[PDB]
Design a protein around this ligand. Structure first.
Ligand code: SF4
Ligand code: SF4
Ligand code: SF4
Ligand code: SF4
Ligand code: FES
Ligand SMILES: [Ca+2]
Lengths: 905, 588, 145
């Protein structure tokens, strides 16, 4: 299309509206109610431009640029006097009731309303009357509510209800008393309620965890990191002040997690700021815990390891690729053990084999929203991979999108699209042991044990393709539901099958692979998504190694007299008694970790490793994309006694001190080169980010904004002399404002978004090639593998149906977004949000055992009797007891295990 | 049309003459807010264009400025030739009362321009400073050494990839630099400094510095001497370099004003005025009349302060140490008024974008009236005590004299240029800050610029500044002390304290900075010691993309060797006392 | 829009009333006598229109209460200079196409017609001088002229 803005000709996309087209050209139009991910509604009336009928026209007409298509031969003006006057008047009308609150408001310096008040040029107040006032509500531990600052732009309700599918936030009231919030005081129930603090252009919804230790945006030190709380790998901007991690903001990635995070990633960072974290290397001598610096710790550990006869290393999916590879190099390839159990490793390797050898294209997180039918097998996506559940909701609304596009309704006219596609939606079929949070939009839900869900998947694959193995013993009603699912999936242009390792069953993954292969054999555009558990579970699966049971066997048998545990608590993947006995039998335990774990009481040496905020590295997310995360701040800048290094740096220095009796720490690119040279499967991690010599016209990339303050006073209480600026030899970023953060800089890693006049998260519009699209020079992250030329064979291992045996109870896994991830429960703001530790019982089984709801029952697992209160679960099948995975005392390895002597105490 | 409007200046006759001589495709005319025609010339035609401008019927006789710009990070370069670096040449034609800014675009690898010294001798130090700070090589330069940084300095500081902030201190670097300070007298080679035939063996080398017993600053001059006669001399400057331009690239438009104070630290508000005027040109702000008269008042007060200190130091350098005490009491009276108005003595930091920080305090006219009654008797007393003395006249008359041609070719401005008989003051030729509404005279000399002629011209300038202060006291408009613009930084304080839109504007202006749209602006004013100028390039951000401060003391120090050649060391001392320079102005 | 006695000899068609500066509407005319103050009548109209706003879009929702407060100030003689100009700017900027629906153009039609035909009643309410700011001790105000 051809448009003419202020007499200047531009080529745009005709399917776009004028606001996003002009913002993609770099032109500045103020806007409040429009969002790139939410569409246009024409509410705030801020984006007014003046449209002319043709080339010669002097009158014009004030039109709404978000509601006006950028058709061919359009003529508009932004800097027209009437348009500028009306935009200033709209800002003035919004500012009539706005409270005098900017000094004590957490959106100050980050406020879109502040930016657009300044940008319209409105600074003189002629309104002399009163301002309307609203009482506030308690929205939970994460979101702070202040309704006085609202401009009634309707972004919160649109996102939370239409986009995120939430049901507890709405708009109430009338003419100028419109209230945006919950119908009563209570926690916001949605798993994506944290994105309200970026969706809201004002300070109505604010990050309360950030508000506890608040600092302004210009005072932050930012880095581009990867969220470490599940396997999705959402791009984040951690921001730091005064030596503590202060906030997690959403960093735009047009391929993964474009504008939105989930609440676990946005509020689960608080384990970084814990005061019990190790800050120095500590050696246990008898009962004393003496403190070493880095060199003496390296020398002593190297000496003791040199006297040992066999040193084994236990990695973890918490640690990055470089840390796991450095441990593997230190202990040897045959002595390296992955930190997960045998069953977890088997499921992880099967999911990896399906992903990179099944011949079916695994989509990115943004690409999930374009699939025409979704089948989720076994995985509770909202509690394990929540952003995938959000993308599934968008893919479900794709049917209404298609129905409106068939009537020549523009794709940004979201209200007309929702009116046309009233309740018609793409088919979603979810299977779980109980109800899921996707059930409000799912076409069907199957509450059944994991064997029965696997049998349902195998039956779907057999009904789609007769060469697939069949399932005998299907009820006629279940067969009717099976053929409903099959007719929905076969008629879909782009079917998507989502499974994962969290179901605790190999057969569920096999059934999902069979369904994907059967859909591929019919010529469909099938995609498959596998949800892993931890941040680098795919990386540890690709690198591979022995299971934790083999490492414990080597420690118990005495064949290994030294164990190096890297970033692992060892209790989520094995029984605590066995781990404690094996570690007590080992004459040397050496734990390299950044969180105070329970296995350090018997550890002979403890290395204070760095968390993701204080380390650089690479992680592989669930889709097989390698992504680099960068250090946010130097932990030794404020406390000079703090010796906290990267895990790969620690282990490479230990290997050097063991071999040549000398200390060499590393550079990060050296470890990256070692990984891509010795492991050809991980050879794609080199292109995840450029090396430390990458420059933008000769200068590095700035971590903090150019108006970063307090440089000569923030450390003045320790010493009046300003210290050396910290040197970052590992990466291309500098720990200072002396760098480049231009929107037009030829780079992909953006630590934070800021443009002059755009201080809010709307500066990402300046950082993109087109608004709502990708980054200008591509998104960071490179897929490790392409899709295979040939697929796998059908999995013939069809399990039998679940038989409830007497005296035993099958443990059904229950996952929580707040509580199941290991590092997130350590965050003290999560204890107000994590549910009470329950045990889920079927009503028939609870009546058989004579237990009501809330009474305490005691069960013994691995000879350890623990007691939990009973919650009645209607959807849980009998013979199963439901346990909350990843909580205190309940390892996630317990999924699918049998429970004995479950009896009321 | 407002004075800050973007003009291409295609109606300038210099553009038509250049089009007729070199052709319509030989150059690119740039539309700026500098007020002068900006013409992008090809590098191979630079000397031809300079010669053509030098041989005009009303020629461009003075190279006002010459420096460089790092254009690699400049996003908004619409209508500009592709340039990694650029070199700009600001030339002034006094006969036309016009000026032109030629610009030469250089690629990153081919960073060399032909030297401009065969047309203008001030291009020696200007090109030395351009090479020192940008790494741009000038072919044909007689000696292209570093002038601001020491010779053993790595990198070029005004480049965009150079870190602005201070590096960590090492006593090892200081100790070795003490070693070169020790062997500098022994291992001195005149070929390094451009001198020839050093040590004939009838010449000796004299070093005055580094610390002089005077208030003009610390610097060195190496002299080639035959007995007591100076044959060759070059000044060693850069001992007062503070990185003010590099600081201008890392401070916001509002937070840079205290740094503009300390350029010429005897000037204060006189130094603040061209910066805030150029920022207001970028912002499109027309200040009200009361702002103009307030700024004129403070500039004239600080001009009288600087002139009094200069006359006192010249008298003390002659040998009479008495009148400096009384004139510092007069400076204390001026400082009393300045403390009352701005809250500070020497660096007020009181001018703002769009106005001034506060309104005038209640009772300013009383202090001004007492000062204006106090001044003339003290001025006549100083005149009769020292400036009519025959010993001072014998020490000052005929010492380091130059004519109009030497002042024009060396960029000398202020008292010396007017002492050469050329009537050129910026307050009359190119008026600013409402100086057309004041009745005052411009003193000029007979045609030869001695020490005595310059000192008497400064005394007459003090008298005219007293006249301007009387007009400021008698006629002051009642109205706003800040503009009615949204870009007035900061907004008026009471509206900030009780209105929320004003609070928003104040919040975003004092924290992130005011957003100046992408343009180039230039303000040239008459400072206390000559002609000062601020050249500001904005890329659309809240900080300056390029701050270029032209100061006259640079040109005066470069004219020092051309005027004292063939004189004595005492003549050099009297000349140094009669220039009215500060080393912060030279080195900035 | 309000019409005077000169428009009483006009046929009740859409085109005729539209060409006179008003609308035929529902064609149920309402007569205003000399006892009714025009400022109070327009205040009643604008109070209805402001309280029956749906709240979707900014000009009606946040500008009809401004006109309501201005007319309330004019009713008791507490109007200040700039009030009638603010009302006229509100009438111009709440026209068709500037708001999400046609409720606010119908809201501002009687206000602009009464300002056009009965301006001497609106000017009678402006008695007090304009004062949006109070004095703050220690800060000299910026006395704009
Ligand atoms: S929401 Fe924005 S305008 Fe309102 S008080 Fe907060 S920072 Fe100020
Ligand atoms: S609460 Fe925030 S997002 Fe919701 S309408 Fe108000 S300003 Fe918009
Ligand atoms: S979906 Fe996973 S990776 Fe993304 S923000 Fe949530 S916990 Fe982090
Ligand atoms: S003009 Fe219509 S859409 Fe806008 S707030 Fe008023 S009644 Fe609602
Ligand atoms: S952005 Fe278009 S009306 Fe709100
Ligand atoms: Ca590092």
């Amino acid at each position: 299309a051809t448009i003419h803005v202020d007499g200047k000709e531009y080529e745009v996309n005709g399917a776009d509206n004028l606001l996003e087209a002009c913002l993609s050209l770099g032109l500045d139009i103020p806007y409040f109610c429009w969002h790139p991910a939410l569409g246009s509604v024409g509410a705030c009336r801020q984006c007014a431009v003046k449209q002319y009928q043709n080339a010669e026209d002097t009158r014009g007409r004030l039109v709404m640029s978000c509601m006006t298509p950028a058709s061919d031969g359009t003529f508009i003006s932004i800097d027209d006097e009437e348009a500028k006057q009306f935009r200033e008047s709209v800002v003035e009308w919004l500012m009539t009731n706005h409270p005098h609150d900017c000094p004590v408001c957490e959106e100050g310096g980050n406020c879109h309303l502040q930016d657009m008040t300044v940008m319209t040029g409105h600074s003189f107040r002629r309104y002399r009357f009163t301002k309307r006032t609203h009482r506030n509500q308690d929205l939970g531990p994460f979101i702070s509510h202040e309704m006085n600052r609202c401009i009634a732009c309707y972004r919160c309700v649109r996102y939370y209800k239409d986009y995120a599918g939430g049901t507890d936030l709405g708009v109430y009231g009338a003419h100028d008393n419109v209230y945006f919030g919950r119908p009563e005081d209570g926690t916001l129930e949605s798993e994506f309620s944290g994105n309200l603090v970026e969706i809201c252009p004002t300070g109505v919804f604010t990050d309360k965890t950030h508000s506890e230790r608040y600092n302004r945006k210009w005072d932050m030190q930012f880095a581009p990191s990867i969220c470490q709380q599940c396997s999705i790998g959402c791009n984040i901007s951690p921001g730091e002040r005064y030596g503590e991690l202060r906030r997690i903001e959403n960093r735009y990635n047009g391929t993964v997690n474009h504008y939105f995070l989930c609440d676990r990633g946005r509020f689960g960072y608080g384990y970084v700021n814990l005061k019990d974290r190790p800050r120095q290397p500590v050696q246990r001598r008898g009962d004393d815990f003496i403190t070493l610096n880095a060199e003496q710790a390296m020398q002593g550990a190297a000496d003791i390891l040199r006297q040992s006869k066999k040193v084994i290393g236990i990695g973890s999916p918490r640690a990055s690729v470089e840390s796991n590879f450095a441990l593997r190099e230190l202990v040897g390839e045959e002595n390296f053990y992955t930190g997960i159990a045998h069953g977890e490793q088997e499921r992880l390797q099967l999911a990896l084999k399906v992903l990179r050898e099944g011949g079916i294209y695994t989509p990115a997180l943004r690409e999930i929203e374009s699939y025409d039918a979704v089948l989720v097998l076994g995985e509770d996506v909202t509690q394990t991979g929540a952003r995938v559940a959000l993308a599934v909701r968008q893919a479900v609304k794709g049917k209404a999108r298609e129905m409106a596009a068939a009537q020549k309704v523009a794709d940004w006219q979201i209200a007309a699209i929702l009116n046309i596609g009233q309740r018609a939606k793409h088919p979603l079929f979810v299977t779980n042991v109980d109800d899921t949070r996707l059930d409000d939009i799912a076409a069907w839900t199957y509450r059944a044990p994991v064997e029965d869900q696997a049998r349902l998947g195998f039956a779907i694959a057999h009904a789609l393709d007769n060469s697939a193995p069949a399932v005998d013993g299907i009820e006629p009603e279940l067969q009717s539901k099976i053929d409903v699912i099959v007719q929905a999936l076969a008629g879909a242009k782009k079917p998507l099958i989502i499974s994962g390792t969290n179901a605790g069953s190999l057969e569920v993954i096999q059934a999902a692979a069979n369904v994907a292969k059967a859909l591929k054999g019919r010529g469909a555009d099938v995609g498959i998504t596998m949800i892993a558990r931890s941040v680098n579970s795919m990386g540890l699966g690709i690198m591979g190694g022995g299971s934790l049971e083999e490492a414990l066997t080597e420690l118990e048998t005495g064949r290994a007299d030294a164990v190096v545990v890297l970033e692992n608590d060892l209790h989520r993947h094995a029984s605590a008694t066995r781990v404690n006995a094996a570690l007590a039998k080992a004459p040397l335990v050496m734990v390299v970790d950044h969180q105070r774990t329970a296995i350090m009481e018997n550890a002979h040496l403890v290395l204070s490793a760095a968390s993701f905020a204080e380390s650089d590295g690479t992680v592989i997310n669930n889709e097989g994309r390698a992504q680099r995360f960068f250090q946010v701040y130097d932990p030794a800048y404020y406390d000079s006694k703090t010796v906290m290094l990267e895990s790969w740096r620690w282990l490479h220095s230990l290997h050097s001190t063991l071999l040549s009796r000398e200390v060499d720490w590393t550079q990060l690119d050296h470890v990256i080169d070692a990984v891509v040279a010795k492991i050809p499967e991980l050879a794609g991690i080199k292109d995840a980010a450029p090396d430390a010599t990458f420059r933008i016209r000769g200068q590095k990339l700035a971590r903090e904004p150019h108006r970063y303050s307090g440089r000569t006073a923030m450390r003045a209480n320790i010493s009046v002399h300003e210290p050396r600026q910290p040197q970052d030899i590992d990466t291309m970023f500098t720990f200072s404002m002396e760098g480049n953060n231009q929107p037009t800089a030829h780079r992909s890693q953006v630590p934070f978004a800021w443009a002059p006049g755009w201080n809010s998260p709307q500066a990402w519009n300046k950082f993109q090639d087109e608004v709502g699209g990708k980054l200008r020079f591509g998104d960071p992250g490179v897929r490790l593998f392409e899709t295979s030329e040939n697929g796998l064979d059908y999995f013939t291992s069809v399990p039998a149906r679940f038989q409830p045996q007497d005296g035993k109870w099958r443990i059904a896994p229950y996952y929580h977004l707040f509580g199941s991830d290991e590092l997130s429960q350590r965050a003290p703001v999560f204890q107000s949000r994590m549910p009470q530790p329950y045990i889920k019982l079927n009503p028939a089984d609870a009546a058989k055992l004579g237990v009501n709801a809330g009474t305490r029952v005691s069960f013994s697992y691995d000879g350890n009797t623990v007691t939990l209160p009973v919650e009645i679960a209607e959807g849980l099948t009998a013979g199963q007891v439901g346990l909350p995975m990843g909580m205190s005392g309940i390892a996630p390895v317990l999924a699918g295990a049998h429970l004995e002597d479950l009896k009321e105490a | 049309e407002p004075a800050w409007q973007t003009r291409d200046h295609l109606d300038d006759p210099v553009i038509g003459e250049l089009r007729n001589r070199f052709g319509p495709d030989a150059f690119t005319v740039q539309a700026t807010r500098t007020g002068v025609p900006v013409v992008w010339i090809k590098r191979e035609q630079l000397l031809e264009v300079g010669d053509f401008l030098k041989k005009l019927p009303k020629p461009y006789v003075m190279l006002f400025d010459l420096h460089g710009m790092d254009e690699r990070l400049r996003t908004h370069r619409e209508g500009l030739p592709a340039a990694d670096f650029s070199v700009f040449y600001h030339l002034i034609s006094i006969d036309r009362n016009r000026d032109i800014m030629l610009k030469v675009a250089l690629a990153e690898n081919d960073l060399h321009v032909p030297t401009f010294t065969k047309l203008f001798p001030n291009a020696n130090w200007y090109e030395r400073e351009t090479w020192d700070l940008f790494g741009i090589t000038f072919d044909g330069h007689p000696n292209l050494r570093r002038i601001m940084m020491p010779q053993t300095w790595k990198g070029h500081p005004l480049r965009k990839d150079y870190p602005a902030r201070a590096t960590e201190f090492s006593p090892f670097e200081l100790t070795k630099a003490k070693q070169d300070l020790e062997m500098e007298a022994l291992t001195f080679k005149p070929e390094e400094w451009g001198m020839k035939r050093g040590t004939n063996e009838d010449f000796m080398f004299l070093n005055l510095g580094p610390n002089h017993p005077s208030a003009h600053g610390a610097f060195r001059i190496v002299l080639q001497l035959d007995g007591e006669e100076i044959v060759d001399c070059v000044p060693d400057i850069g001992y007062h370099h503070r990185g003010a331009e590099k600081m201008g690239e890392r401070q916001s438009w509002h937070s840079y004003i205290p740094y503009t104070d300390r350029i010429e630290y005897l000037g204060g508000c006189v130094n603040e005025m061209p910066y805030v005027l150029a920022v207001e040109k970028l912002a499109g702000i027309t200040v009200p009349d009361r702002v103009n008269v307030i700024r004129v008042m403070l500039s004239e007060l600080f001009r009288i302060n600087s002139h009094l200190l200069y006359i006192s130091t010249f008298i003390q350098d002659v040998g009479a140490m008495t009148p400096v005490f009384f004139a510092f009491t007069d400076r204390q009276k001026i400082y009393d008024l300045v403390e009352a108005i701005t809250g500070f003595r020497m660096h007020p930091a009181w001018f703002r974008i769009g106005g001034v920080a506060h309104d005038l305090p209640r009772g300013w006219d009383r202090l001004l009236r007492e000062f204006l009654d106090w001044m003339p008797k003290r001025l006549a007393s100083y005149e009769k005590a020292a400036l009519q003395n025959t010993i001072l006249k014998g020490r000052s008359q005929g010492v380091a004299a130059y004519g109009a041609k030497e002042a024009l070719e060396w960029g000398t401005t202020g008292a010396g240029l007017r002492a050469t008989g050329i009537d050129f003051d910026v307050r009359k030729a190119r008026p600013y800050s409402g100086y057309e509404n004041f009745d005052f005279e411009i003193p000029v000399g007979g045609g030869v610029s001695d020490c005595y002629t310059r000192v008497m011209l400064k005394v007459e300038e003090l008298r005219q500044s007293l006249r301007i202060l009387e007009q400021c006291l008698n006629n002051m408009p009642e109205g706003p002390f800040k503009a009615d613009h949204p870009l007035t930084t900061p907004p008026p304080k009471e509206r900030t304290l009780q209105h929320i839109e004003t609070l928003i504007t104040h919040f975003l202006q004092v924290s992130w900075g005011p957003v100046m749209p992408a343009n180039e602006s230039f303000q040239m004013i008459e400072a206390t010691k000559g002609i000062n100028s601020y050249y500001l390039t904005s890329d659309g951000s809240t900080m300056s993309y390029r701050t270029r401060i032209r100061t006259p003391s640079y040109a005066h120090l470069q004219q020092i060797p051309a005027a004292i050649r063939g004189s004595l060391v005492s003549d050099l001392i009297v000349y140094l006392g009669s220039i009215d320079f500060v080393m912060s102005d030279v080195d900035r | 829009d309000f019409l005077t006695e000169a428009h009483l000899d006009l046929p009740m068609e859409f085109e005729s009333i539209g060409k006179a500066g008003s609308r035929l509407g529902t064609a149920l005319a309402m007569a205003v006598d000399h006892e009714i103050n025009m400022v109070s009548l327009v205040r009643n109209l604008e109070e209805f229109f402001a309280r029956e706003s749906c709240g979707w879009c900014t000009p009606c929702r946040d500008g009809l209460p401004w006109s309501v407060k201005i007319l309330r100030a004019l009713e008791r003689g507490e109007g200040q200079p700039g009030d009638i100009e603010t009302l006229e700017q509100l009438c111009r900027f709440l026209g068709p196409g500037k708001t999400f629906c046609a409720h606010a153009p119908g809201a501002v039609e009687p206000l602009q017609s009464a300002i056009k035909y009965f301006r001497e009643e609106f000017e009678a309410g402006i008695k007090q001088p304009f004062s949006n700011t109070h004095l703050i001790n220690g800060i000299q105000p910026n006395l704009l002229k």
